[PDB]
Every structure is written in structure tokens, then in C-alpha cells.
Amino acid sequence: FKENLEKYAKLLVANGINVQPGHTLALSIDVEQRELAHLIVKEAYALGAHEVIVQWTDDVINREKFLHAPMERLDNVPEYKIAEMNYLLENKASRLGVRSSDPGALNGVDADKLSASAKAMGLAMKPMRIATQSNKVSWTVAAAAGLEWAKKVFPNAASDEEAVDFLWDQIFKTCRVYEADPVKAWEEHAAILKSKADMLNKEQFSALHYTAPGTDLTLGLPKNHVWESAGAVNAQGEEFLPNMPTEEVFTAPDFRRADGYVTSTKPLSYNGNIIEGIKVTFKDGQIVDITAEKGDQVMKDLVFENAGARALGECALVPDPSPISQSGITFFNTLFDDNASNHLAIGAAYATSVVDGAEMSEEELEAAGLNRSDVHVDFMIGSNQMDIDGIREDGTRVPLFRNGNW
Amino acid sequence: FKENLEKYAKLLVANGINVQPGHTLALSIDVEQRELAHLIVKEAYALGAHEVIVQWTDDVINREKFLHAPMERLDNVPEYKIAEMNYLLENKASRLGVRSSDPGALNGVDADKLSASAKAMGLAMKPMRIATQSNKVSWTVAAAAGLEWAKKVFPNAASDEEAVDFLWDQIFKTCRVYEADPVKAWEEHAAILKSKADMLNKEQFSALHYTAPGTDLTLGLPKNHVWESAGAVNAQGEEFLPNMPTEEVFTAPDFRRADGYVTSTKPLSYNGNIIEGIKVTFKDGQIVDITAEKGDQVMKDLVFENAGARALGECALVPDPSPISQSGITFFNTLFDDNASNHLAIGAAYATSVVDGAEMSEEELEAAGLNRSDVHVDFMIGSNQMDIDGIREDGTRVPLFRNGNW
Numbered sequence A, B: 001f002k003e004n005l006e007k008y009a010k011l012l013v014a015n016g017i018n019v020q021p022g023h024t025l026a027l028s029i030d031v032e033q034r035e036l037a038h039l040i041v042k043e044a045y046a047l048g049a050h051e052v053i054v055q056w057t058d059d060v061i062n063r064e065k066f067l068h069a070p071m072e073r074l075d076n077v078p079e080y081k082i083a084e085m086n087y088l089l090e091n092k093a094s095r096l097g098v099r100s101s102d103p104g105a106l107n108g109v110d111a112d113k114l115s116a117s118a119k120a121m122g123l124a125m126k127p128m129r130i131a132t133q134s135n136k137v138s139w140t141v142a143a144a145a146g147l148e149w150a151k152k153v154f155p156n157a158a159s160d161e162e163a164v165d166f167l168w169d170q171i172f173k174t175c176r177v178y179e180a181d182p183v184k185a186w187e188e189h190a191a192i193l194k195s196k197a198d199m200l201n202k203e204q205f206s207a208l209h210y211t212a213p214g215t216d217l218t219l220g221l222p223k224n225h226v227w228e229s230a231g232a233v234n235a236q237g238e239e240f241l242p243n244m245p246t247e248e249v250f251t252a253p254d255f256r257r258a259d260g261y262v263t264s265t266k267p268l269s270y271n272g273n274i275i276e277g278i279k280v281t282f283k284d285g286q287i288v289d290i291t292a293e294k295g296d297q298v299m300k301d302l303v304f305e306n307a308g309a310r311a312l313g314e315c316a317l318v319p320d321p322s323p324i325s326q327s328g329i330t331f332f333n334t335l336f337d338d339n340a341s342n343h344l345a346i347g348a349a350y351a352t353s354v355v356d357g358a359e360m361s362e363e364e365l366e367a368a369g370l371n372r373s374d375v376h377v378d379f380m381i382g383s384n385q386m387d388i389d390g391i392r393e394d395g396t397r398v399p400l401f402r403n404g405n406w
């Protein structure tokens, strides 16, 4: 364990945040993971950082503040937290966020108090959100095996230690830690993901044809679409990885081009429900029927009660042989569950899925063919029996996936 | 363990810091003690606190910073740190500091980086140092059984876990946590301690005569001197305990009235040395001869190589039967070891040991008889054999200690 956890640490500061000499790093991490934090701080200074600032998190104590503090302490952000953000901004600090996800960490908390805080914080920390969204500084989101998440992922474990050990093992396996040189393994894997995206971006397929057991579906793609995966580059030219781990290569379909049907292959976790065996039927871009062996009404309510929820906003590729795909585990954490399999999203497209989408207007994205909606629900459809062809503007079929792989 | 830890948390927020409705509490505590941290934060809020700010500490990570960060990051205090301090002052926040001892935590660090930081910190945090020293806000220093400290206190324990268990057992014992109502137990004990100080202040003895094995000493007391113990009161009139635990009742001797000899009765930890069997020889106020069974050279340089070090600044009384006294253990922590026995201190007197001495100049204190030195070193001299008389004006003998108790 101590050996693997130190390899994890090194992987996060080299491929995740790419610490260089001179750098300031802000690490956001649970007090429960103090051992991983010691290692991250040690590896960060060894790559030359001049300062690592640890912003320690604790679910029990933050829940206390939310229960008891008066609204006046929640909707006013104290000046010292803005000064802290300004220090980080001025030193171009990288943001490494290592999260363990317990979903009922805020049980009993009033939604209005949470919302008041999220609003006041959302405004006061906007300079930090702009810097990270626009990639001015490097940032990575990763995971750590906290007790309450681990009990949720492995509710049948023999004990709490076991639940925790099984979750660490998943994290090490899916982040390539058991490899002899994880740093190298991720450099190589990142270049492969980026060459898939680059290949599909040079193709500019007109449509995608998927066939599998319970699936036959043609989805058209928007003109000037962008496939994204893997890493980014920050404002100083440094290569970084926003997510550890990561597999998918995704774009937006044209929301007014869809015919056929598709069945889900992996449990979907949505609003506290586990939904199984979904089958979606499309005609003219639109969902005309949706069913599930489990959570039927939830799925209907989703599509036939939310604006924009009768169309797709995302199509994503992931080899079936890849590590999350091969786990068979529901993690209830998007970082992992949305890298599990080929998938499609009900609802909103990401703006960056078309060229210059970041600048376009709401009316303009619609024009470009990107779905707008307030919901966005990714559901897995891939398996070792899925085939996919890209369809060129002149109907020529180019094989992309056979039996669930490139 | 969990039931005792919860009782300990309650005692810290009730008798230690005395949280009242509407208060702000800052708790400084190691990430290693997150479980005690959860409990203190829950009880402070249950008593009506409007905000608990937890300033988490971590020795490993702080040492990394001192070992690897440039001087520029260490000799300066960032503005956000000063802003945080001001938010606490503005909110009259109480300061609960829960510490585990490790003087060896900053091993390998450049001495130069150490004093530059300490001097910057001391200038920058001055407003908070003056607020706490004058008891404007409540503050308490207490202990938590950290692994590193536990290994130092119990070097013979069979495992890390047994060392910490042993140290927690000492903390709980001495802090009266095993009692049914620790909160009630400290109210009584603090009143007892306070009545002792009150009683000794009423008598204004002229001197004390100590007799025990290896010990014959008369100490002159200063005119209008003040015995101190236990609780204080903050500027809002709220009562609080600055130290948990505490037992000693102390004042300063007139640095110029002493003759005789005294021998220490408990190991002394001074500058990383363990010092045993000390015999100190006084005449007309001055130290004329100090010898020691172990560390004889250290004790010689102490007194003869430091300005002021040839006279006493403190005489304290602790009942031989009290918990730390009986434990027999060297804690390597002043909070504990300085409450272990009757003792004397070589060097500096506390200003508060004469009436209004807090309002006096260094010139003023010395004229009043209070030693001034850059050094202050307590050594234990109590046992169950010790007899102490308060010598009145007319020279009437009053018995204060018989056989090491009142």
C-alpha cells in the first residue's frame, strides 16, 4: 500500500498537474487522507515547487457549519477567503482536488442554506473559476478511497477496512498505478486518446452507425464538430490532465438527427435511483419512446418532463477493454462512471463540442445543432459486441469500433 | 475510547474555552486528531456557537515547507493570513489549541529559515498575541495523543497503537475524564486551586522554608506578591481555563533573598537533555554551586553562561498526590511536566507575580524584586517527604506543606 500510494502521488503531480520549478500548488484533500497528502506534498517539492498550500476538507465539520451557522455567515464570504484566492491567483497556483465522494455527506442540511452559500461563493470565487475553466492554470480532479464512499461502492464487504481496500485497489487499477512506470503509461495513454480525437476531428463524419444486441441507431453529427479527450494545455504552455483517471473521447451529436433504438448496458445512477436496461427509440432526432426494466417512470419523467430532454447532447467512445469498463463496478462518481463505456447523454450538449462554441449564443448553439437543456444524463451502451461505423458525407462507411474496440 | 473522547471534547468547550451562544471558536488541531476535532466542533455548536473555524495543523507538511521552500516564501507573512487573524479578532473568537508535542518535528531545517519565519510571524500576529495575553478573548491549551509524541513518552511500548493508547490514558486520567461529570470535577478543582491562591495572597508571608531529603532552603518572597492558579476571566466577563490540565499554584521569589541547598526530585528535560539529581546551592540570593548526577555540565553552563541565571524567578506548589505527580512519567511537554511537582525556576520571574506587575517596566519589576533573564527553567523538587513553612513577619512559622500535601 505505502508503495502504491507513493506511485499515485507521483502520478498526480507529474501527469495531473505537471509541477515545474517555481510553481505554487494548492491541494484540496480530506483530513482522512493525510498519508496521501504527505506524499503529494513530498513529491511536489521534489519536482521543484516553491510552495504547496494544503486546503484540508472534512465532511463532518462542513455539515456542522451548514446545520448551525446563521444565514448571515453563509451568504457573505469573509474577506480573508477572497484574499486567499487572490494569493493563489497571483502565484498562478495549480489546483489539485483529490475527492472522496460521499453523497449523503450533507444529509439533513437545508437546500436553501446550501444554495445561499453556493451562490455567495460562486460570485466571490468567480476569478478562480474563470482561471481554471479557461485553463489559465493547471488543475486536476482525482479520487481517494474515503470510508463512506467505499461503503457505498462495496456495500457487501466483510468490513470497513475491506470496503476501503477494495476501493483503493480500483483506484490504483484504473489509474495505472500497478504499472512499472505510471507517469510513462499516462503520457503514452494521453497521446493515444489525443490521436483518436485528432483522427475523428480530421474525419468530420456526417453520422455514426451503432449496432449491438438491442441497438441499431444512426446519429448525425453537427457540421464543424469537436471531439475532445485527455489533456489540456495551460496559459504558460504546460501540458496537464484535468481528470485522473480519464478514457472517453466525446462530442455532441446533431440533436435533430437521430433514427433507431439503443439499449443501456450498465446500471445508470441518477437522483438516487439505479436504473437498468433502458431502451430509447428515436425518430427525427427525438425520443418517441423510452423504457427500462428498472426505473421506467423515472426515465419517462426525465425525458417527457424536462425541456430539451427528448434529444441527445453527447456521444462518447471508450474501448470495452479499458479498466473502468472491465471493472463491472458502479462508483457513483462521474469521474469514473462517465468513463465506463460508450455512452450517450440525454439533454445538454457542451458548447465546446462545436468550433468556437464557447463564444456562440444560446440561439446560435441551437442553430449549430447543439442541444440545450437543464438536464444531462449520460447512459452507457457499450459492450464487447458493439460495432460502430463513421458515415462520410457521401455514405461511405469507415469502421471505428468492432466488438467494442477501435 | 469514543465515549471518553466525547467527554474530553465536552470538557474542552465547557470549562476550557466556555463557549456561549453567538460565539466564534477557532480550534487549532492536528489532522491526525480529526476524530477529536469532529467532537469539539459538534459540542461547540450544541452550546450555541455561530461559527467554528478549524485551523488544521500537520508537522510533516510544515517541515516540508521549511525544508524545501525558498526564503522569500518563509520570511514574509502573506496578507491573507493577516486578514484571517483580523477576522478572528473582529469576531472576538476564542482560541482552543489542541497540541501534540514534538520538538523534533523541525529536524534538519536551516536555523536561518526558522528565525526569519518566527520573526515575521511574531510581527504579523502581534495583535492576536496581545489580545490573548491580556485575556481579551478566551483561550485554552490542551493535549491530544499524537503518535510521535506517544513514542517519546512510552519508548518501551510494544506497538505504535499501544503507545498512543497509553498516552491517551494519561491525558484522560489527568484531565479527570474517567469521572462521571468531568465538567463538574473541573469546577470544583478550579475553585479549590483558586481558594489556595486566595489564601496565600491574604497572608503575604515574608518567606518560605523548604525541608526535605537533600533540601534546606529559605526563599525570600517579594513585597505585595501575587500567587496565581487555574482560571482567568475574559473581557466580556466570561470565566475560562487557559490550561487543561493544570494544578500548580505559583508566584515569584524576591531574586535577592535566598540561602541554602535544594535537590531536584524528578527528571528534567532541558534542551533535549535529561537532567537528574540536581543540587543547587544558594547564598544571600545568588546561586553559588549547581551540581547534577546527569547533565552536570549543562546545568553549569545554564546558570553561569546566561544573564540572570544565578537566581530564581518562580516558586510553585503542587500536591504530591495529584494526578501528574503520581503518574511518575516524563511527558516532555511543559503543560504536563510543569504541573508535576513543587518546583522552582531558574531565571525569569513572571510580571504578574507582584501587584499590577503587568503595568511595570523591566526597570520597575527588578526594583520590586523580580528576576529578569532570557532563560526560565523549572525543576521539580517535591515528594511526599517535603515540609514547607510560610515564615511570617515577626518570623512566626506557619505550616504550608506537611509530607508533600497542604
Ligand SMILES: C[As](C)(=O)[O-]
Pocket (backbone or CB within 6 Å): A248, A250, A314, A316, A334, A338, A345, A378
Ligand atoms: C463527464 As461527461 C464529458 O461524459 O458529461
Ligand SMILES: C[As](C)(=O)[O-]
Pocket (backbone or CB within 6 Å): B248, B250, B314, B316, B334, B338, B378
Ligand atoms: C508553566 As510555569 C507558570 O511553571 O512557567
Ligand SMILES: C[As](C)(=O)[O-]
Pocket (backbone or CB within 6 Å): B334, B337, B338, B376, B377, B378, B379
Ligand atoms: C517548561 As517550564 C516554563 O516549567 O521550565
Ligand SMILES: [Zn+2]
Pocket (backbone or CB within 6 Å): A248, A250, A314, A316, A338, A343, A378
Ligand atoms: Zn461522456
Ligand SMILES: [Zn+2]
Pocket (backbone or CB within 6 Å): A314, A338, A345, A376, A377, A378
Ligand atoms: Zn456527459
Ligand SMILES: [Zn+2]
Pocket (backbone or CB within 6 Å): B248, B250, B314, B316, B338, B343, B378
Ligand atoms: Zn510552575
Ligand SMILES: [Zn+2]
Pocket (backbone or CB within 6 Å): B314, B338, B345, B376, B377, B378
Ligand atoms: Zn515556570
